[PDB]
């Protein structure tokens, strides 16, 4: 502990979702591990109410969002001899979508203006994290860079920071954002290519 701090961030903004735990991972063990990076205020492994065994996922709540980020960047993690995937505690609106707690570093931005530049949304979304590339989707009718855009992040954490808020104000305009799944992720089918 010991930090001159007064948290301003809601539980969802300082809680992490731990995926891929062991079948024997306890909440005491889960805390103890992630507590290395910051003060945990809460921790619980989602166990079965029937047999009281671990469902292989849980959550850890940090004191401050900053301590969360330090745990985010510290990935990958290993609790109980198990490679665990700490992620952002997705808001129930976005967590109601297919592939919400999955590792998604892509977001959709729709319902924008007559044109929007990379510089606009890149400079905005980069506040949340490092961006790999920006996908600007063009209009087929007008030929303008409008209608919707896509943003590729280096980490899933930055995307999840964003999808927590379905609508964001970019360049003085409220645009809609959400999880954007990669085409492989969306298909989930047997891709058989041999260079072709």
Swiss-Prot record:
Chain segments carrying region Globular B domain: 95-185
Residue(s) of cross-link: Glycyl lysine isopeptide (Lys-Gly) (interchain with G-Cter in SUMO2): 3, 8, 78, 179, 183
Phosphoserine PTM positions: 2, 4, 6, 22, 192
Protein name: Heterogeneous nuclear ribonucleoprotein A1
Cellular component GO terms held in the UniProt record: catalytic step 2 spliceosome; cytoplasm; cytosol; extracellular exosome; membrane; nucleoplasm; nucleus; ribonucleoprotein complex
Gene Ontology molecular function, alphabetical: DNA binding; G-rich strand telomeric DNA binding; identical protein binding; miRNA binding; pre-mRNA binding; protein domain specific binding; RNA binding; single-stranded DNA binding
N-acetylserine modified-residue sites: 2
Biological classification of the source: Eukaryota, Metazoa, Chordata, Craniata, Vertebrata
Source organism of this protein record: Homo sapiens (Human)
Residue positions where Omega-N-methylarginine is found in the record: 194
Glycyl lysine isopeptide (Lys-Gly) (interchain with G-Cter in SUMO), cross-linked positions: 113
The gene coding this protein: HNRNPA1
Residues of the whole record sequence present: 2 to 196 of 372
Keyword tags: Acetylation, Amyotrophic lateral sclerosis, Cytoplasm, Disease variant, Host-virus interaction, Isopeptide bond, Methylation, mRNA processing, mRNA splicing, mRNA transport, Neurodegeneration, Nucleus, Phosphoprotein, Repeat, Ribonucleoprotein, RNA-binding, Spliceosome, Transport, Ubl conjugation
Modified residues (Dimethylated arginine): 194
